[PDB]
Write a protein that binds this ligand. Structure first.
Ligand SMILES: Nc1ncnc2c1ncn2[C@@H]1O[C@H](CO)[C@@H](NC(=O)[C@@H](N)CO)[C@H]1O
Ligand SMILES: Nc1ncnc2c1ncn2[C@@H]1O[C@H](CO)[C@@H](NC(=O)[C@@H](N)CO)[C@H]1O
Ligand SMILES: [Mg+2]
Ligand SMILES: [Mg+2]
Lengths: 136, 136
């Protein structure tokens, strides 16, 4: 799993066209104030251990940032070893569930399988942009 | 080299604190309308051939998008095989020079060695977000 942690002042997205025939989540849009935006690329070796490490790390980083909202943002673009779409969707659902056991704020999992538009104002501080890899 | 191609409606950034002792570019800020924003991670194996492939590809993609501004945005976060900072800065300068031989619009190379804040409104169309790897 490859993640990009963007500490934002604000974030929004809208699904636009479907990127898979039959996206497994319905279309939507949402907008947020301050939030940790986690662009999340699920990779071929990713199982439940990987999901648990990622969830602990996101919770731990969110705490150090003192953020109370996490956006789990499915992203196809951070790796060239992608998990297949059905397995990736499953891992993202597990990550959301795992994060809620460790982190007490708002956890928003954005829909999987769509092209999206988005805007972000990303903060400028030293820990505002970090990347992470998890595996098992 | 790992790149992320973000076709934006608008883009802006400001350098904030230095991320290296002695950033090799001076601090600054800039804001743009529609632009191809290229987040660019220079990797250990990257030489002049790599820079030339990347420049051709960026020009080719910019043309297919019909964009007339490219932002070369140094980014430490797309790989776990980074080139050292001096070599990375050199490759980014070469990429800017190479791109200008192939692409006729505005080429903006953002300063290297700083933490930055930024905002982007990224477009929603199917080719609005792509990643690329180049090597030699
Ligand atoms: N291995 C993977 N890890 C995370 N997400 C993945 C994935 N494989 C497919 N997706 C999702 O399918 C959309 C089309 O690739 C992807 N959509 C996106 O990457 C949008 N932000 C593009 O605008 C994403 O929702
Ligand atoms: N191998 C590499 N490829 C591209 N850029 C690189 C690099 N090594 C260092 N940098 C630059 O140094 C700043 C601190 O890591 C980096 N700054 C950034 O990544 C900011 N956008 C963070 O807010 C970047 O300018
Ligand atoms: Mg809608
Ligand atoms: Mg300034």
């Amino acid at each position: 799993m490859r993640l990009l942690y963007l500490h934002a002042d604000r974030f929004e997205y809208k699904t636009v066209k479907p990127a898979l025939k039959n996206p497994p989540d319905p279309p939507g849009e949402a907008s947020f104030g301050e939030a940790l935006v986690v662009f999340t690329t699920v990779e071929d070796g990713d199982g439940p251990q990987t999901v648990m490490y990622a969830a602990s790390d996101i919770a731990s980083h969110s705490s150090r940032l003192k953020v109370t909202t996490v956006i789990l943002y499915p992203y196809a673009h951070l790796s060239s070893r992608l998990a297949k779409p059905m397995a990736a969707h499953k891992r993202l659902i597990e990550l959301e569930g795992a994060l809620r056991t460790k982190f007490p704020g708002h956890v928003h999992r954005a829909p999987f399988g769509w092209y999206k538009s988005f805007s972000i104002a990303c903060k400028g501080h030293p820990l505002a942009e970090l990347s992470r890899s998890f595996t098992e």
